[PDB]
Design a protein around this nucleic acid. Structure first.
Ligand code: HEM
Ligand SMILES: CC(=O)N[C@@H]1[C@@H](O)[C@H](O)[C@@H](CO)O[C@H]1O
Ligand SMILES: *[C@@H]1O[C@H](CO)[C@@H](O)[C@H](O)[C@H]1NC(C)=O
Ligand SMILES: *[C@@H]1O[C@H](CO)[C@@H](O)[C@H](O)[C@H]1NC(C)=O
Lengths: 94, 457, 80, 96, 100, 108, 98, 79, 107, 94
DNA sequence: TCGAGAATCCCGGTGCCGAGGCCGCTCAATTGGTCGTAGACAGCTCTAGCACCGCTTAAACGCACGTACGCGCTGTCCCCCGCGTTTTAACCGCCAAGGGGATTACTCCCTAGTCTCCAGGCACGTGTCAGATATATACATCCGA
DNA sequence: TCGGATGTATATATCTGACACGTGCCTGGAGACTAGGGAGTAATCCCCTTGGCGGTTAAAACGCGGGGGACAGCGCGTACGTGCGTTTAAGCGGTGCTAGAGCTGTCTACGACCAATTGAGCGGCCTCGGCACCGGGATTCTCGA
């Protein structure tokens, strides 16, 4: 059978990080997978449009940051930005 | 000048008719209700105002029954009992008191054909179209009988007639009208079908009989016949049009309908230009052999428009919502030509006096269309009324089954042409648009046939 | 072939109850049936176009999801 | 015993706003979907998930439209919903 | 109401004779006659139309429609099947009889 | 060759940096994709997932259940302003509706 | 002293402003408002003239459409006067304040 | 900086007349000003974000066009 | 080599086929672009432009004007059902609004 | 200065085909240019999505035709399809 | 209905500025081969979609009552409209500075592309425990006396 | 306004199927290295944005009178909610067949990729006529008799 990759193992790992005593069903897992795919596609499309607007041929972390600022509403966006920045900083340290 | 004669007066310095006292023959149309004067005059439509292939099956009961091949129980149509085109059916001959067909060639002694219309023998081309439709009906009846052995003659005949009528409607409204009106006019005047509307009047208007004369501007001066290789077929590859009018002997005794169809499929039409309206063959040598003197098609059109009491150019411009010119400059702006506007104003004196046909064919054509805005308006309105007011429209629910509808939606004229007779190479999609050989021709071994498997009971 | 009457009056009444409606007029049901038919026609037309482009004969759930996303009605829980 | 008109209505409102089930019978909806799709293609097959997704989308659409209709009805100082409320909601939403 | 009546009658239920054959044409605009009832513009010599003389149709065909034959311009996007189908559909639609 | 370590481990994430990089490269978004873009995108997706899952788990606990069903996800989304704005035009299957009744319809 | 009954000059204004395509808000006050609003997000910002013109066109189109929906809401409740509740209902059904 | 009062009552009346409004209550002016302020704040925030990404200090017309298009409010005539 | 012939002339169009092909190739749409996609897209764009311009020119002529202004484009778009549905979320600058007064407001 | 391209000359050619005696202003040209760009981007994006869904690496005439069918409303779409098809046929003949 | 007063509309001047047509270059498009991979076939398997059939039984469907709500129909009054008189600042026209978009060099870094290998993540198999399903009970609420 | 009836939440047993692990294996991600071009600096250039002033006048502000909608109150009747009994297909099972979706293999023709050439489109420049206002009257609509 052909493999079908999905964001199920990672979503379960995050859930175990947040709620150690709470499980999840299959329909809820499908909903979360769809949510992750949708948000990924939205952010990537906004970043691609931003790169096209400024006549650049590269998607960088600045494009992702601006796409997150444009799409996510209010306080959410701010927090998201912080998280992303931290990751890159750690990724640079290693 | 006595009724019912309305002869055409000859102006001085005429190129052809030197004698001014001579007159071109002309007969006024029959009144709707003669014997009275208070009621306004009206003309009679002798045919059903529907797209139901009433040119093959007739419009009156006696003629319709006489057309049927009433000796068997297969529901076929009568064919010729003396001649055949390579073993293929021809239109039955007709007996008339004064047959113009025999006047063209006394030696041949070949009479006119019989069909659903009395004018089916003007040229070999119209006769070829009628014969092709007759052969298609016969083939459909044979296939329906073979597939359904329980059906009697009447049911087979009626089903074949319905299929042929639906085929004519499909071909017309899917290929011919877009090439006449163009995309914009077709979208404006023939939007998507919704449903049958009993409040819509499908009667043919009086102006439509003169607003569909536009095809007189597409006539070529010769008839072309081609062999199997689409090469000029000898003898007489190109025949002058003045010698093919009412000449049925050129069909039975000159190789059948295959060369005529091949010539039609692969010959460009005449382009209508403001300086080239109509050819001289139909303007000076129309029905030369049949009548004492040649007729004049544009003059006949204008005289008939006068006889029918139709309003002028500006009245129809107002009816269709277009601006109405009043002076020479306005006419030159509207027609996009100043010499033509000057000539028209010299002839008539005011745009309100211009006949509907002349003004309609004098306008610049639409984009990707063959008519001006006024003629497009009239023709689109008439055909929309015909489509919406028809209870037996092929797309109407209850007339055809969905599987039957999907089967019918794949028909095409080239398929019928290369199915019902001997031509093997035909034109591509939109036969009305392809005229170059062999740039856009196929062997029709690729075009699917009509699937009658959905007609099994 | 009158399956639009399979959407019965009790079903429409339940759908209105979920929406917070306390009293319903008697002519609401025909209007609701028309609205539902229009919505279904649009969505199914888009889904069948998507199916035809793939040269398939079965309308999969992904075609419906893509059609809904086209109309601006993103749906979670089916496909991806 | 008999309840006053409006008590069972509020009880049903409370009951159907706590559940998550589908309120339309599955077989009539499947037949309706197949009949509608008959107009576009002949001999069409449907996955079960396709019909399920169509039903979920239709139910969500109808529930949201009924909420808007209730708002329109209350605006005009009424308690019952009428077809004109549905028409106004669909006109403001832009669906007309 | 199963098949088409050969005369076109009973197609419209409200008006059975509406759209059938051997009936009068429908007028989209009121008719215009030189006298008012049944006389065409040109029947009586010297009678003007809209304050202007009535032109001869033969003359209009003579010096407006006319063009030399050798200047014929073939149409690059249409075939003769275009005109043939136009004539066939036309012979389907309408026909105005005249006395013999 | 040394022992391989996933880029998500270096970035301290749970979501896959490499898979996100491949999806960005194959998705026809731009001619080139930087090295830091997958890390940022994975971090943002992980944050959003954690937020929504925490809210859904709180709803499930309030409902006295130890497993998240679509009803809990819908309750979590519709009760948060930012999440509701993010998913305004999104339908959740088997999610139901938020219980509200207009004050006009209540008995007086 | 000639006087028009109430609602006549209103209909005349409706006919007159539905026939023109001009901008119905004074340009200098709108530019000042735009600059004041933009002050919060960034400091020492410059604006192209085309940017302010585009903002004005978009704002006027938005307000005209909102007022059409508000008029429909007013007529629904058997009224002629336009009240704030009509604006709120139109914005809620559109989804702006939902 | 009370420039929201620069959108005067006659201007709002003109905008309502173009929308077909015959009679106007006296309380819709403040509501209209609030609605316009909210719309302008959203659009200008998006435009300033677009400007900041390009490392510019001038808000061009293309930034406003992109900001409007991001909200499903496409505007024709400014490139 | 032989004389150069544009692809637009070969296809019989007025809109460019080479430029549309380049825009498709460099627009980050797909890995490869077929040879018939630019022709189809150019034909569709030319058709839509012709429709809009014909309606706008009719509107301008009814206004006794020679040039086309944004008001005429707005009148053309809003008075056509299909075009209004296509550009339903589009604002035309300096276009105004369609004249329409509710019946209840009239005296 | 620089070189900025637009659909200006082609729109004027089409206009002179439709209305040979009618001109056009600058704002109307800007609107027409924006309209052409917007429709191009819509159709191209829909075709790209169609190609991605079916795991194809090529945008062909089938993708463009399906995108036109999905996006353009009503009989409009039908007419557009015809035009496009004709062009391709001609392009193959020459 | 009939007349007086405003308002809008339909025609001749009168400039003027923007749309349309003409040159000069240069930078994409076109023409002419090469190549390698994406897609167009054929076969083939097996999964899942369609059809059928019998049984409960929960849902839907008519029917009857009555009550509460939708809908007109007054009546008041106050809030908005129309109009005239003062302010006010928008608008136009003209100058002057300088900030900062916008090209143009040059040169690094940063990313794509290629082997190699080797663990993270799928598919498949299993079992047990959340959760669905009865059953009785007990509060909670509603409508009437 | 204290008692009865209906409805719904609660606690306790029973059973089950689906979710959470375990294991094998394959393929895609990580580790190196190289090569080329995209973007980051810097250094000018000149454009267009901001800031200022002065005069004219059109529009915003204020105030006043009146009339015509907004809103509340009050019948009146009818249509919708609530039960109740009688059809009616919906849902659940187990069974069977086969259409077609998905996978594998081969191969070929079509699109990317180079180089060389040139002409189509863009920028700059005139230039004249369509349009925007001027004057005047003409026609129509509205409100008081
Ligand atoms: C091709 C050569 C044709 C010839 C020689 C011819 C001959 C004639 C003549 C002489 C008439 C006399 C009355 C009239 O002119 O209206 C007529 C009738 C008519 N023609 Fe033509 N015709 C031709 C083609 C066409 C075409 C192609 C069309 C339409 C596309 C057309 C439309 C009509 C109509 C509507 C009538 C009215 C019927 C009648 O008056 O009897 N004709 N035909
Ligand atoms: C000049 C001309 O047309 N002559 C024909 C002749 O060719 C034909 O054989 C004969 C019998 O049909 O009729 C005559
Ligand atoms: C039709 O009638 C003709 C008369 O010529 C006859 O030859 C023929 O057999 C009839 N049709 C059939 C199908 O028998
Ligand atoms: C039928 O046609 C008439 C006349 O065009 C039109 O007014 C009417 O709405 C149409 N009816 C339907 C049901 O389409």
């Amino acid at each position: 059978k052909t493999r079908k990759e999905s964001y199920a193992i990672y979503v379960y790992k995050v859930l175990k990080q947040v709620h150690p005593d709470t499980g999840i069903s299959s329909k809820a897992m499908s909903i979360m997978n769809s949510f992750v795919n949708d948000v990924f596609e939205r952010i990537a499309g906004e970043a691609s449009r931003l790169a096209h607007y400024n006549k650049r041929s590269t998607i960088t972390s600045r494009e992702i940051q601006t796409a997150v600022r444009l799409l996510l509403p209010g306080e959410l966006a701010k927090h998201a930005v912080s998280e992303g920045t931290k990751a890159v900083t750690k990724y640079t340290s290693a | 000048q006595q009724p019912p004669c309305f002869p055409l007066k000859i102006p001085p310095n005429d190129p052809r008719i030197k004698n001014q006292a001579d007159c071109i023959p002309f007969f006024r149309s029959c009144p709707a209700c003669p014997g009275s004067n208070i009621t306004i005059r009206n003309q009679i439509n002798a045919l059903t105002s529907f797209v139901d292939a009433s040119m093959v099956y007739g419009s009156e009961e006696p003629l319709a029954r006489n057309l049927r091949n009433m000796s068997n129980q297969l529901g076929l149509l009568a064919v010729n009992q003396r001649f055949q085109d390579n073993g293929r059916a021809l239109l039955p001959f007709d007996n008339l008191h004064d047959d113009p067909c025999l006047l063209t060639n006394r030696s041949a002694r070949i009479p006119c054909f019989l069909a659903g219309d009395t004018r089916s023998s003007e040229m070999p081309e119209l006769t070829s179209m009628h014969t092709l439709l007759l052969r298609e009906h016969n083939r459909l009846a044979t296939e329906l009988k073979s597939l359904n052995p329980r059906w009697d003659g009447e049911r087979l005949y009626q089903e074949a007639r319905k299929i042929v009528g639906a085929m004519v409607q499909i071909i017309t409204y899917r290929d011919y009208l877009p090439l006449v009106l163009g995309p914009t006019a077709m979208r404006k005047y023939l939007p998507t079908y919704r449903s049958y509307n009993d409040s819509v009047d499908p009667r043919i208007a009086n102006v439509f009989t003169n607003a569909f004369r536009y095809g007189h501007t597409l006539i070529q001066p010769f008839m072309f016949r081609l062999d199997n290789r689409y090469q000029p077929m000898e003898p007489n590859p190109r025949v002058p049009l003045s010698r093919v009018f009412f000449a049925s002997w050129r069909v039975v005794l000159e190789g059948g309908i295959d060369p005529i169809l091949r010539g039609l499929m692969a010959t460009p039409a005449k382009l209508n230009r403001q300086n080239q309206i109509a050819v001289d063959e139909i303007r000076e040598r129309l029905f030369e052999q049949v009548m004492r003197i040649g007729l004049d098609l544009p003059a006949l059109n204008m005289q008939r428009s006068r006889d029918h009491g139709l309003p002028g150019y500006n009245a129809w411009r107002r009816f269709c919502g277009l601006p109405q010119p009043e002076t020479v400059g306005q006419l030159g702006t509207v027609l996009r030509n100043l010499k033509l506007a000057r000539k028209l104003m010299e002839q008539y004196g005011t745009p309100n006096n211009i006949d509907i046909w002349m003004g309609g064919v004098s306008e610049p054509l639409k984009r990707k269309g063959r008519v001006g805005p006024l003629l497009a308006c009239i023709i689109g309105t008439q055909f929309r009324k015909l489509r919406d007011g028809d209870r037996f429209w092929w797309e109407n629910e209850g007339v055809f089954s969905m599987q039957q509808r999907q089967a019918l939606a794949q028909i095409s004229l080239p398929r019928i042409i290369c199915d019902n007779t001997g031509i093997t190479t035909v034109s591509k999609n939109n036969i009305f648009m392809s005229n170059s050989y062999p740039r856009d021709f196929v062997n029709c071994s690729t075009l699917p046939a009509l699937n009658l498997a959905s007609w099994r009971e | 072939r009158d399956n639009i009457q399979g959407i019965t009056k009790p079903a429409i009444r339940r759908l209105a109850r979920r929406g917070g409606v306390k009293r319903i007029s008697g002519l609401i049901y025909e209007e609701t049936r028309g609205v539902l038919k229009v919505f279904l026609e649009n969505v199914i037309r888009d889904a069948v176009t998507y199916t035809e482009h793939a040269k398939r004969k079965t309308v999969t759930a992904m075609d419906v999801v893509y059609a809904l996303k086209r109309q601006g009605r993103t749906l979670y829980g089916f496909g991806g | 015993h008999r309840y006053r008109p409006g008590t069972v209505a509020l009880r049903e409102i409370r009951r159907y706003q706590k559940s998550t089930e589908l309120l339309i019978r599955k077989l009539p909806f499947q037949r309706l979907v197949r009949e509608i799709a008959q107009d576009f293609k002949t001999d069409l097959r449907f996955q079960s998930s396709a019909v399920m997704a169509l039903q979920e989308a239709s139910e969500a659409y109808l529930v949201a439209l009924f909420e808007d209709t209730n708002l329109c009805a209350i605006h005009a100082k009424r308690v019952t919903i009428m077809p004109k409320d549905i028409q106004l909601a669909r006109r403001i939403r832009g669906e007309r | 109401d199963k098949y088409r009546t050969i005369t076109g009658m009973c197609n419209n239920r409200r008006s059975p004779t509406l759209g059938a054959s051997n009936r009068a044409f429908v007028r989209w605009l009121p008719a215009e006659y030189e006298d008012g009832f049944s006389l065409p513009y040109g029947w009586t010599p010297g009678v003007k139309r809209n304050g202007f003389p009535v032109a001869l149709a033969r003359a209009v065909s003579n010096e407006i429609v006319r063009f030399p034959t050798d200047q014929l311009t073939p149409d690059q996007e249409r075939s003769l099947m275009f005109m043939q189908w136009g004539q066939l559909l036309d012979h389907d639609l309408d026909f105005t009889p005249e006395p013999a | 060759r040394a022992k391989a370590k996933t880029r998500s481990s270096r970035a301290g994430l749970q979501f896959p940096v490499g898979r996100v990089h491949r999806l960005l490269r194959k998705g026809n978004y731009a001619e080139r994709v930087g090295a830091g873009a997958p890390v940022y995108l994975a971090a943002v997706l992980e944050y959003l997932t954690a937020e929504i899952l925490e809210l859904a788990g709180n709803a499930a606990r309030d409902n006295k259940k130890t497993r998240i069903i679509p009803r809990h996800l819908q309750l979590a989304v519709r009760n948060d302003e930012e999440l509701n704005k993010l998913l305004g035009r999104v339908t959740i299957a088997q999610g139901g509706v938020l219980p509200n009744i207009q004050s006009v319809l209540l008995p007086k």
